[PDB]
Design an enzyme around this catalytic site. Structure first.
Site, PDB file in Angstrom:
ATOM      1  N   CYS A  15       0.730  -1.320  -0.048  1.00 12.74           N
ATOM      2  CA  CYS A  15      -0.094   0.030   0.289  1.00 12.74           C
ATOM      3  C   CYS A  15       1.646   1.015  -0.609  1.00 12.74           C
ATOM      4  O   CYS A  15       1.339   1.311   0.803  1.00 12.74           O
ATOM      5  CB  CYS A  15      -0.734  -0.111   1.334  1.00 12.74           C
ATOM      6  SG  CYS A  15      -1.636   1.528   1.000  1.00 12.74           S
TER       7      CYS A  15
ATOM      8  N   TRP B 235      -8.814   6.348  -0.766  1.00 15.64           N
ATOM      9  CA  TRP B 235      -9.617   7.172  -1.981  1.00 15.64           C
ATOM     10  C   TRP B 235      -8.597   7.179  -3.068  1.00 15.64           C
ATOM     11  O   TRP B 235      -7.071   5.759  -2.410  1.00 15.64           O
ATOM     12  CB  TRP B 235      -9.383   8.816  -1.700  1.00 15.64           C
ATOM     13  CG  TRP B 235      -8.129   9.133  -1.090  1.00 15.64           C
ATOM     14  CD1 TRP B 235      -6.502   9.793  -1.630  1.00 15.64           C
ATOM     15  CD2 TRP B 235      -8.028   9.629   0.185  1.00 15.64           C
ATOM     16  NE1 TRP B 235      -6.244  10.174  -1.105  1.00 15.64           N
ATOM     17  CE2 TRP B 235      -6.566   9.671   0.378  1.00 15.64           C
ATOM     18  CE3 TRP B 235      -9.252   9.681   1.546  1.00 15.64           C
ATOM     19  CZ2 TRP B 235      -6.235   9.967   1.921  1.00 15.64           C
ATOM     20  CZ3 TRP B 235      -8.501   9.845   2.826  1.00 15.64           C
ATOM     21  CH2 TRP B 235      -6.762   9.842   3.016  1.00 15.64           C
TER      22      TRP B 235
ATOM     23  N   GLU C 219      -4.461   4.144 -10.677  1.00 13.52           N
ATOM     24  CA  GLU C 219      -5.733   3.385 -10.020  1.00 13.52           C
ATOM     25  C   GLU C 219      -6.581   2.922 -11.077  1.00 13.52           C
ATOM     26  O   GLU C 219      -6.986   2.361 -12.105  1.00 13.52           O
ATOM     27  CB  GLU C 219      -6.000   3.839  -9.201  1.00 13.52           C
ATOM     28  CG  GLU C 219      -4.940   2.863  -8.602  1.00 13.52           C
ATOM     29  CD  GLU C 219      -6.168   3.008  -6.524  1.00 13.52           C
ATOM     30  OE1 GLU C 219      -6.219   1.810  -6.181  1.00 13.52           O
ATOM     31  OE2 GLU C 219      -5.829   3.864  -5.762  1.00 13.52           O
TER      32      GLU C 219
HETATM   33  C1  HEM Z   1      -6.604   6.137   2.178  1.00 13.15           C
HETATM   34  C2  HEM Z   1      -5.780   6.395   1.134  1.00 13.15           C
HETATM   35  C3  HEM Z   1      -5.782   5.144  -0.048  1.00 13.15           C
HETATM   36  C4  HEM Z   1      -4.606   4.963  -0.946  1.00 13.15           C
HETATM   37  C5  HEM Z   1      -4.325   6.869  -1.818  1.00 13.15           C
HETATM   38  C6  HEM Z   1      -4.046   3.404  -1.349  1.00 13.15           C
HETATM   39  C7  HEM Z   1      -3.350   3.413  -2.468  1.00 13.15           C
HETATM   40  C8  HEM Z   1      -2.912   1.836  -2.554  1.00 13.15           C
HETATM   41  C9  HEM Z   1      -3.229   1.538  -3.798  1.00 13.15           C
HETATM   42  C10 HEM Z   1      -2.499   2.610  -5.039  1.00 13.15           C
HETATM   43  C11 HEM Z   1      -2.548   0.397  -3.671  1.00 13.15           C
HETATM   44  C12 HEM Z   1      -2.449  -0.751  -4.901  1.00 13.15           C
HETATM   45  C13 HEM Z   1      -3.903  -1.037  -5.832  1.00 13.15           C
HETATM   46  C14 HEM Z   1      -3.876  -1.681  -6.991  1.00 13.15           C
HETATM   47  O1  HEM Z   1      -2.442  -1.678  -7.302  1.00 13.15           O
HETATM   48  O2  HEM Z   1      -4.539  -2.740  -6.793  1.00 13.15           O
HETATM   49  C15 HEM Z   1      -3.054   0.080  -2.357  1.00 13.15           C
HETATM   50  C16 HEM Z   1      -3.160  -0.950  -1.852  1.00 13.15           C
HETATM   51  C17 HEM Z   1      -3.356  -1.874  -0.414  1.00 13.15           C
HETATM   52  N1  HEM Z   1      -4.206  -1.286  -0.047  1.00 13.15           N
HETATM   53 FE1  HEM Z   1      -4.094   0.848   0.248  1.00 13.15          FE
HETATM   54  N2  HEM Z   1      -4.479   3.006   0.117  1.00 13.15           N
HETATM   55  C18 HEM Z   1      -5.589   4.149   0.671  1.00 13.15           C
HETATM   56  C19 HEM Z   1      -5.783   3.152   1.689  1.00 13.15           C
HETATM   57  C20 HEM Z   1      -6.077   2.079   2.761  1.00 13.15           C
HETATM   58  C21 HEM Z   1      -6.436   1.863   3.649  1.00 13.15           C
HETATM   59  C22 HEM Z   1      -7.360   2.488   4.227  1.00 13.15           C
HETATM   60  C23 HEM Z   1      -6.095   0.737   3.880  1.00 13.15           C
HETATM   61  C24 HEM Z   1      -6.573  -0.388   5.062  1.00 13.15           C
HETATM   62  C25 HEM Z   1      -7.235  -0.696   6.350  1.00 13.15           C
HETATM   63  C26 HEM Z   1      -5.828  -0.081   2.491  1.00 13.15           C
HETATM   64  C27 HEM Z   1      -4.503  -1.036   2.475  1.00 13.15           C
HETATM   65  C28 HEM Z   1      -4.473  -1.719   1.296  1.00 13.15           C
HETATM   66  C29 HEM Z   1      -3.446  -2.725   0.746  1.00 13.15           C
HETATM   67  C30 HEM Z   1      -3.832  -4.388   1.964  1.00 13.15           C
HETATM   68  C31 HEM Z   1      -3.507  -3.544  -0.407  1.00 13.15           C
HETATM   69  C32 HEM Z   1      -3.066  -3.997  -0.690  1.00 13.15           C
HETATM   70  C33 HEM Z   1      -4.009  -4.699  -2.129  1.00 13.15           C
HETATM   71  C34 HEM Z   1      -3.359  -6.251  -2.552  1.00 13.15           C
HETATM   72  O3  HEM Z   1      -2.901  -6.712  -2.044  1.00 13.15           O
HETATM   73  O4  HEM Z   1      -4.353  -5.961  -3.690  1.00 13.15           O
HETATM   74  N3  HEM Z   1      -5.179   1.000   1.585  1.00 13.15           N
HETATM   75  N4  HEM Z   1      -3.400   0.615  -2.225  1.00 13.15           N
HETATM   76  C1  LIG Z   2      -8.894   1.138  -0.011  1.00 12.25           C
HETATM   77  C2  LIG Z   2      -7.800   1.442  -0.953  1.00 12.25           C
HETATM   78  C3  LIG Z   2      -7.630   2.034  -1.712  1.00 12.25           C
HETATM   79  C4  LIG Z   2      -7.107   2.771  -2.860  1.00 12.25           C
HETATM   80  N1  LIG Z   2      -6.539   3.853  -3.010  1.00 12.25           N
HETATM   81  N2  LIG Z   2      -6.202   1.416  -4.016  1.00 12.25           N
HETATM   82  C5  LIG Z   2      -7.312   0.177  -3.307  1.00 12.25           C
HETATM   83  C6  LIG Z   2      -6.913  -0.933  -3.986  1.00 12.25           C
HETATM   84  C7  LIG Z   2      -8.501  -1.470  -5.122  1.00 12.25           C
HETATM   85  C8  LIG Z   2      -8.834  -0.721  -6.396  1.00 12.25           C
HETATM   86  C9  LIG Z   2      -7.449  -0.765  -6.830  1.00 12.25           C
HETATM   87  C10 LIG Z   2      -7.477  -0.288  -8.460  1.00 12.25           C
HETATM   88  C11 LIG Z   2      -6.137  -0.293  -9.126  1.00 12.25           C
HETATM   89  C12 LIG Z   2      -6.497  -1.180 -10.834  1.00 12.25           C
HETATM   90  C13 LIG Z   2      -6.342  -2.640  -9.541  1.00 12.25           C
HETATM   91  C14 LIG Z   2      -7.780  -3.605 -10.039  1.00 12.25           C
HETATM   92  C15 LIG Z   2      -7.375  -4.738 -10.439  1.00 12.25           C
HETATM   93  N3  LIG Z   2      -5.630  -3.961 -10.714  1.00 12.25           N
HETATM   94  C16 LIG Z   2      -4.935  -5.032  -9.537  1.00 12.25           C
HETATM   95  C17 LIG Z   2      -8.606   0.207  -8.780  1.00 12.25           C
HETATM   96  C18 LIG Z   2      -9.640   0.189  -8.498  1.00 12.25           C
HETATM   97  F1  LIG Z   2     -10.770   0.951  -8.662  1.00 12.25           F
HETATM   98  C19 LIG Z   2      -9.842  -0.757  -6.791  1.00 12.25           C
HETATM   99  F2  LIG Z   2     -10.917  -0.354  -5.824  1.00 12.25           F
HETATM  100  C20 LIG Z   2      -7.430   0.247  -1.773  1.00 12.25           C
END
Ligand code: HEM
Ligand SMILES: Cc1cc(N)nc(CCc2cc(CC[C@H]3CCN3C)cc(F)c2F)c1
Ligand code: HEM
Ligand SMILES: Cc1cc(N)nc(CCc2cc(CC[C@H]3CCN3C)cc(F)c2F)c1
Ligand SMILES: C[C@H](O)[C@H](O)[C@H]1CNc2nc(N)[nH]c(=O)c2N1
Ligand SMILES: C[C@H](O)[C@H](O)[C@H]1CNc2nc(N)[nH]c(=O)c2N1
Ligand SMILES: [Zn+2]
Lengths: 416, 414
Positions: A114, A286, A291
């Site tokens: 994250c 947010w 993304e």
């Molecule tokens: C508040 C602003 C946040 C931003 C800008 C953000 C941004 C991101 C982004 C860009 C990713 C990569 C996701 C992807 O490419 O699919 C990610 C992954 C992740 N985020 Fe954050 N996130 C936010 C909030 C949170 C919160 C509130 C949580 C949990 C309480 C969280 C937990 C995670 C986890 C567990 C992943 C790994 C997801 C996976 O393995 O598919 N995030 N986040």
């Molecule tokens: C808590 C939280 C905050 C933020 N900012 N992102 C996430 C990941 C979830 C999330 C991530 C993406 C990026 C493209 C993803 C879809 C396939 N590729 C891995 C697109 C989404 F629409 C989405 F929902 C979680």
């Protein structure tokens, strides 16, 4: 051993020293002989035993009382004593509300993939451990969405449903995100809507959903409580904030008819705290622009609009070396960021986000002794090397509490 | 210790990796910590005792490669290397083994997106070299052959192997052709900031610098462990390209140029336990190596403000993506320029597409292909190239190109 591990940043020569990795618990899937850092998912009704659970709870309780500067106090020992007895007489135990809030914030803090973790400690935790029905889940989730959306000024939140017990009474959100668009595989092999969601859309239709068969249909919630078959619920449309995508310079960009929802909210991961497994724990934040603008819109197996945008830009599309793809990609991402800002919906560009994360990571090294990070996921999907994270060495390891993956429920559910 | 699968998530193609079972050098990761974004994870001469098994294994895989495993030739080539390690503490590679070793180091180069070409490699055996003048001779032949008037050809030149640490051949240049970087009085940098130290070392040795923005550095060549000597590359051998833009006519006014020949010269080639500390090797550029990294890194030429300025873009907030816009234009310019001057160059879309095709070949015929996703994904436009969505297994096969210490930190002059 070794007690210390240095990471360098190759754009600033700044060097950090990591001692936190000594507290890592689970396996990465790498060995001394092979690295699996670009593998997406490395690593039944089976659940932890008494003897497995004792050290996992003790470890977590010790950590929690360490954080409130009360390690070894009488309250610490009496909490250990209480928990060891619950585990003995019930094979499980219940977190105090203060431990549940701690564990959740720390699952976010520990999430090596994250980039948004500088906000980790500011997270609204909705305790939903009293929920017993899918209707109740639906009520908790709507309150989650409304609170988090906040009329565009988004706030991060998590809603935590009852923990796993015997494995046959699991609470699950079957949605992968609370808000997604539907995908409709046509008879001619084309796809309308979001190709990533074709399978889930078909399960929803089978459970009785009447699809409008449009390009941007919000999917219904499919919600399983206490192990029963799941149930469909429509999210009240006034709770789904959406943003029409337009471009500040290109008049025609609105003619593409694109829009996206405001609230990214993962709902399919498992939350592990002190050996307890919260299989339903939707959390939201947010968006980082890319993304939506790179993955959701330009991935070939997603909305895949690069071609159409390039055509309206009148770019040479005959060879790759014109970089028509790269040109259209940037414009699409400018339009996404322009639209969310103009509607005063919270969004963060990839420059600001990575720059915040470098600062967060340094502070964590300073104040905590490390910050696990997954370079393959932290680096944005466009313009990587012009963001500070590209040049930043990172250590990836698994701390608990943690968000983990879990199999899709339709593969495991026993229909009653 | 099983077969491992990798999946491409765009195409859902799944490949099965058996080759990693044959690796034996360490990655630096553990079951608890992954280090795949560490750039250099962790008297360096092996003794006789370490040396024979290494040698035995390399000869084994060489004869296995030519479908003559356990043959008579193989049985006796083994005894030859046993006897030689005995009596000299080292041994000498046949010409064929040298060429096979070199090509297979390139093939095992996990960080190299260009490996679809690994077996078209011109190998220049310079193991008879004894002096820096001889090194300068072999290197100019390399540059002239590999440049080929713009139709670049892949090549490596291999100087004598390490013996006791004190008699070591080194090219002190990180690349055969680089631009000098000058520390300014006002504190700024003219030219390439990446070579500011090395530029000072050459000045400290007698080089008179033109103090321009694109000055080709001299060669600093160390032979047999002596002090390094400077040499001027004949300028008729240094092919360059003036960078202009196919739409913006003001882009030539930036006065940018770059050299056609990328030639890494600071690495160590390891074959069968032998160490070739001087082994400059060269191919052709992927446009992003120049247009993203060389030109737009902060610690490099750092031209992005300038370009977006002349593009009259809003540079106040980051979320105008003014850096991203200017970066695509700079890279269009670079590709347009090389192609217009008929100098071999590959764009990152075609190169990653070729690497996926190479990955399929290698899994089919070899059972795997070690690949470093962190280095294979290009530094821009990542997820619009096929490698972004390609899972990769990284493991360490020998022969291999290794890193080695910078020469100025090891060398004791006389
Ligand atoms: C508040 C602003 C946040 C931003 C800008 C953000 C941004 C991101 C982004 C860009 C990713 C990569 C996701 C992807 O490419 O699919 C990610 C992954 C992740 N985020 Fe954050 N996130 C936010 C909030 C949170 C919160 C509130 C949580 C949990 C309480 C969280 C937990 C995670 C986890 C567990 C992943 C790994 C997801 C996976 O393995 O598919 N995030 N986040
Ligand atoms: C808590 C939280 C905050 C933020 N900012 N992102 C996430 C990941 C979830 C999330 C991530 C993406 C990026 C493209 C993803 C879809 C396939 N590729 C891995 C697109 C989404 F629409 C989405 F929902 C979680
Ligand atoms: C023929 C065209 C070639 C292309 C397009 C190409 C492309 C690349 C690129 C983009 C990188 C990453 C470079 C960096 O960021 O530092 C790289 C690395 C590398 N290449 Fe290739 N290459 C080519 C030829 C060769 C040859 C001929 C060899 C060896 C005989 C080779 C061996 C390597 C090695 C060892 C690395 C890793 C260097 C390091 O880790 O610093 N390449 N290549
Ligand atoms: C044999 C061979 C062929 C090709 N195509 N590339 C290489 C890598 C060498 C190479 C790599 C780059 C990338 C930019 C800077 C930042 C990190 N990296 C050193 C810039 C060069 F100027 C150069 F020479 C080797
Ligand atoms: C920290 C990280 O390992 C470092 O910045 C790497 C990342 N990936 C790279 N990839 C390539 N092709 N070239 C590089 O110089 C780097 N640098
Ligand atoms: C193969 C590779 O592991 C996979 O495609 C990864 C690459 N990095 C990523 N990074 C983010 N943020 N999200 C992703 O889905 C991926 N996908
Ligand atoms: Zn690893």
């Amino acid at each position: 051993c070794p007690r210390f591990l240095k990471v360098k940043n190759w754009e600033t020569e700044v060097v950090l020293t990591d001692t936190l990795h000594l507290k890592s618990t689970l396996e990465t899937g790498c060995t001394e002989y092979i690295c699996m850092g670009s593998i997406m998912h490395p690593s039944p009704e089976d659940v932890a035993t008494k003897d497995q659970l004792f050290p996992l709870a003790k470890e977590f309780i010790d950590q929690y009382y360490s954080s409130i500067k009360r390690f070894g106090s009488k309250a610490h020992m009496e909490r250990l004593e209480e928990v060891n007895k619950e585990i003995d007489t019930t094979s499980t135990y219940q977190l105090k509300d203060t431990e549940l809030i701690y564990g959740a914030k720390h699952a976010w803090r520990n999430a090596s993939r994250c980039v948004g973790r500088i906000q980790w400690s500011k997270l609204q935790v909705f305790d939903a451990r009293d929920c017993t029905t899918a209707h109740g889940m639906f009520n908790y989730i709507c309150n989650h969405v409304k609170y988090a959306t906040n009329k565009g000024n988004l706030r991060s939140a998590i809603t935590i449903f009852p923990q796993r017990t015997d494995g046959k009474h699991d609470f699950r959100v079957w949605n992968s995100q609370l808000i997604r668009y539907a995908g409709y595989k046509q008879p001619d092999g084309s796809t309308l809507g979001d190709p990533a969601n074709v399978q889930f859309t078909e399960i929803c239709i089978q459970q009785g959903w009447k699809p409008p068969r449009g390009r941007f249909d919000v999917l219904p919630l499919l919600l399983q409580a206490n192990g029963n078959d799941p149930e469909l619920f429509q999210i009240p449309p006034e709770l789904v904030l959406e943003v029409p995508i337009r471009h500040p310079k290109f008049e025609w960009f609105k003619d593409l008819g694109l829009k996206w929802y405001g609230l990214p909210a993962v709902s399919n991961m498992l939350l592990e705290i002190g050996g307890l497994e919260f299989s339903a724990c939707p959390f939201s934040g947010w968006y980082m622009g890319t993304e939506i603008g790179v993955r959701d819109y330009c991935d070939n197996s997603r909305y895949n609009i690069l071609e159409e945008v390039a055509k309206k830009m009148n770019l040479d599309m005959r060879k790759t070396s014109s970089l028509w793809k790269d040109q259209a990609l940037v414009e699409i991402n400018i339009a996404v960021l322009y639209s969310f800002q103009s509607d005063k919906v919270t969004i963060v560009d990839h420059h600001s986000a990575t720059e915040s994360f470098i600062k967060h990571m340094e502070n964590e090294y300073r104040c905590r002794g490390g910050c696990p990070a997954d370079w393959v996921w932290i680096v944005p999907p466009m313009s990587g090397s012009i963001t500070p994270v590209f040049h930043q060495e990172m250590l990836n390891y698994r701390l608990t509490p943690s968000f983990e993956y879990q199999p899709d429920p339709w593969n495991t559910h026993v229909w009653k």
